[PDB]
Amino acid sequence: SLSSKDKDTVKALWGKIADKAEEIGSDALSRMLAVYPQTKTYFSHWKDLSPGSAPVNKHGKTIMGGIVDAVASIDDLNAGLLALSELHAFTLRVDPANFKILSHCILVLLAVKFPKDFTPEVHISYDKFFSALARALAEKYR
Amino acid sequence: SLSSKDKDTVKALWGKIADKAEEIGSDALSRMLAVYPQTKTYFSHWKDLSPGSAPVNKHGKTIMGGIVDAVASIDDLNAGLLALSELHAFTLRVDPANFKILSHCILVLLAVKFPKDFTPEVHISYDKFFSALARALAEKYR
Amino acid sequence: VVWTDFERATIADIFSKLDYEAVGGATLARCLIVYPWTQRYFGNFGNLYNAAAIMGNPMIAKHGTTILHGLDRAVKNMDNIKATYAELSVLHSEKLHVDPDNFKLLSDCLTIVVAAQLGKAFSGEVQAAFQKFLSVVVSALGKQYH
Amino acid sequence: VVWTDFERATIADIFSKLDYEAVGGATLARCLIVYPWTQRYFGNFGNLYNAAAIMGNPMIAKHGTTILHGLDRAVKNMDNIKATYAELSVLHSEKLHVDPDNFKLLSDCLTIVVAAQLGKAFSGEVQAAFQKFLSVVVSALGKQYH
Numbered sequence: 001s002l003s004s005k006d007k008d009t010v011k012a013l014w015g016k017i018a019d020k021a022e023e024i025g026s027d028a029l030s031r032m033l034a035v036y037p038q039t040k041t042y043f044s045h046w047k048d049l050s051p052g053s054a055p056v057n058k059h060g061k062t063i064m065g066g067i068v069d070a071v072a073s074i075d076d077l078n079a080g081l082l083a084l085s086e087l088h089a090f091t092l093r094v095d096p097a098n099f100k101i102l103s104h105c106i107l108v109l110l111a112v113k114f115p116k117d118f119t120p121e122v123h124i125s126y127d128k129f130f131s132a133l134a135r136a137l138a139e140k141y142r
Numbered sequence: 143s144l145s146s147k148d149k150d151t152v153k154a155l156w157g158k159i160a161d162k163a164e165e166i167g168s169d170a171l172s173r174m175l176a177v178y179p180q181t182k183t184y185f186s187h188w189k190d191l192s193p194g195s196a197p198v199n200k201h202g203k204t205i206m207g208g209i210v211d212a213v214a215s216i217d218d219l220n221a222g223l224l225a226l227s228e229l230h231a232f233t234l235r236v237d238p239a240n241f242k243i244l245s246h247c248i249l250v251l252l253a254v255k256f257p258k259d260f261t262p263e264v265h266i267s268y269d270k271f272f273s274a275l276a277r278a279l280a281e282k283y284r
Numbered sequence: 285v286v287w288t289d290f291e292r293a294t295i296a297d298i299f300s301k302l303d304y305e306a307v308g309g310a311t312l313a314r315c316l317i318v319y320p321w322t323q324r325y326f327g328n329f330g331n332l333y334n335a336a337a338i339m340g341n342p343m344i345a346k347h348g349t350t351i352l353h354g355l356d357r358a359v360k361n362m363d364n365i366k367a368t369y370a371e372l373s374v375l376h377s378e379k380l381h382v383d384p385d386n387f388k389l390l391s392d393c394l395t396i397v398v399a400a401q402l403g404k405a406f407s408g409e410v411q412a413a414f415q416k417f418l419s420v421v422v423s424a425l426g427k428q429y430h
Numbered sequence: 431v432v433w434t435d436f437e438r439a440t441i442a443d444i445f446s447k448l449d450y451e452a453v454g455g456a457t458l459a460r461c462l463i464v465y466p467w468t469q470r471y472f473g474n475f476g477n478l479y480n481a482a483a484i485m486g487n488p489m490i491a492k493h494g495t496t497i498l499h500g501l502d503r504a505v506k507n508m509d510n511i512k513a514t515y516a517e518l519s520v521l522h523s524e525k526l527h528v529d530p531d532n533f534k535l536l537s538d539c540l541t542i543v544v545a546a547q548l549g550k551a552f553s554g555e556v557q558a559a560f561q562k563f564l565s566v567v568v569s570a571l572g573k574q575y576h
């Protein structure tokens with residue numbers, strides 16, 4: 001469970017990455033696909049897995065949108081991400097194993113762009129948020 | 143999250159195992175220590191890690207007691223197990239990786255004794271229960 | 285790995301008591317019901333529906349049995365498991381990309397099916413040797429770096 | 431493992447840019463702060479208190495340095511990492527009983543410290559090579575069954 005401290009840190013982070021958000025999601029997705037090729041199977045219906053490629057660009061916008069959703073619902077992530085949980089369970093059937101990979105790649109991408117924001121205490125808030133995220137998306141598996 | 147059918151299955155089992163519960167806890171702890179010797183370091187202050195040994199016997203009682211608390215608090219494990227969480231985080235400092243080990247050994251011990259209760263759908267409820275348990279005990283780590 | 289004489293004997297003894305078809309089918313169906321995400325690796329089997337659909341699935345029973353005979357292969361090659369599973373490792377990592385947590389989830393379900401069958405005979409010490417065997421197995425099935 | 435040329439170059443190049451003392455001390459501190467249960471393995475260090483106690487801890491600093499030198503031994507032995515880490519694997523499994531999830535936690539923290547330091551240089555390709563290196567090292571550290 002996130003503290004009020006954790007929530008403000010995450011919300012402040014999410015402000016700061018404003019102009020960069022869609023590009024952050026595209027590059028994080030590129031990182032996942034290249035660093036962890038296990039994940040490529042779910043996007044077989046693509047071209048073109050490099051960042052900057054149009055499918056990756058547009059789906060990176062989509063991922064960051066789901067996370068800005070999580071930020072607006074940070075108080076109860078289980079309820080706020082129910083639709084996305086169901087879709088990742090039943091429509092796409094995504095191994096919950098993989099939510100942490102994406103989160104890691106988002107955090108790595110962020111750290112290359114906003115390193116001053118990754119104090120150990122902040123990284124701790126971000127990790128707790130992304131773990132709560134994954135768990136929220138895992139809710140409807142069983 | 144446990145469904146009301148998961149909760150009813152868990153309470154049903156808990157009723158069935160009444161006369162055997164303290165012995166289930168002792169044997170499960172015996173299994174943990176021999177199958178997963180990693181866990182032996184937390185009980186260095188013992189003498190004889192066999193089941194039936196007095197310390198393991200009495201601590202088996204105690205575990206099964208915490209699990210009975212969990213059953214009473216099955217509607218919100220996070221709130222119900224908060225002191226036990228704090229204890230396992232700060233007083234004893236237990237690697238949360240170990241909660242799944244003890245849960246598995248409890249399910250194994252139960253299977254050897256009550257195999258008829260291990261239909262696939264029952265096992266699913268029990269596994270969800272002990273996962274939520276483990277996650278409740280993990281709450282106070284950070 | 286190096287096996288104790290006790291370890292070597294109880295592994296051989298456990299498998300000698302299992303109906304591979306019975307236990308295999310039961311094991312894989314348990315995994316697919318308790319850990320539904322694993323169903324995704326077997327997209328071409330049948331019903332992603334009820335536990336009843338999984339339970340009567342003949343393709344699932346078939347494949348469950350194949351897993352057990354694959355385990356028997358390790359039981360027949362106790363001091364040579366890595367090499368024995370070399371091609372199965374390639375298949376399961378390189379080709380299928382089975383997240384290795386799944387090997388443990390399936391192993392845990394096998395353990396629980398075996399426990400239920402064997403009963404009080406499945407003591408802590410017997411469970412220790414079974415678990416070491418499954419660790420050796422799952423290690424030889426996983427990505428080989430070395 | 432089979433390493434491409436870009437992978438060998440990339441790994442050697444990364445380690446050539448890291449001050450082992452600063453990066454090690456920072457990596458271990460971050461692991462102990464972000465995943466505080468990992469503190470238990472280092473019971474004999476000092477302050478289990480604030481992040482500021484962890485950050486100023488000289489013993490933590492020191493051990494962080496040792497981890498980095500440990501990694502250098504794999505960078506200097508890229509085609510023989512398992513054998514190189516044989517006693518290290520024994521130490522962390524058989525002796526210290528570090529749950530292996532912790533190896534990945536620590537490696538992820540180091541990945542974030544290096545990403546912060548290197549910046550745009552730490553591309554997806556560069557991260558892929560570094561992650562492959564760390565996978566090989568974590569498997570080698572790694573209770574060994576073969």
Ligand code: HEM
Binds near residue numbers: 039059062092098
């Ligand atoms: C933080 C974690 C994640 C978030 C927030 C997220 C969010 C989303 C959203 C918002 C959509 C599409 C909704 C729509 O516009 O219709 C989506 C689709 C999808 N997600 Fe995720 N997702 C996450 C993790 C993952 C992971 C780890 C994988 C696989 C490794 C995955 C695979 C997919 C796939 C295959 C689609 C459909 C893509 C398409 O049809 O183009 N997701 N995700």
Ligand code: HEM
Binds near residue numbers: 241245
């Ligand atoms: C189902 C999960 C668990 C439950 C319900 C549980 C419950 C309890 C309870 C009720 C106590 C009594 C506290 C006291 O009287 O001091 C306790 C103590 C303890 N537990 Fe757990 N526990 C669990 C998991 C674990 C695990 C996995 C480990 C380590 C591998 C562990 C290590 C300890 C230790 C070292 C103590 C103190 C022992 C003593 O006072 O002699 N616990 N636990």
Ligand code: HEM
Binds near residue numbers: 372
């Ligand atoms: C106890 C560990 C396991 C053992 C010993 C094992 C063994 C085997 C064997 C012997 C085969 C037959 C290879 C062939 O067709 O020539 C096979 C195929 C396969 N296994 Fe595994 N397996 C294990 C675990 C898993 C797990 C956890 C999954 C996924 C969750 C999995 C997914 C598959 C798939 C998708 C195939 C190929 C399906 C087909 O083409 O018919 N296996 N396995």
Ligand code: HEM
Binds near residue numbers: 468472501521526567
């Ligand atoms: C990539 C990951 C790691 C590497 C390369 C590594 C390397 C090392 C090395 C080189 C030593 C000193 C051994 C000696 O003196 O011969 C050591 C000691 C130690 N490590 Fe690790 N380690 C890693 C991960 C971890 C983790 C995750 C933990 C705990 C969570 C840990 C806990 C310890 C402890 C308690 C010692 C005792 C130091 C001493 O001998 O005084 N290590 N490690």
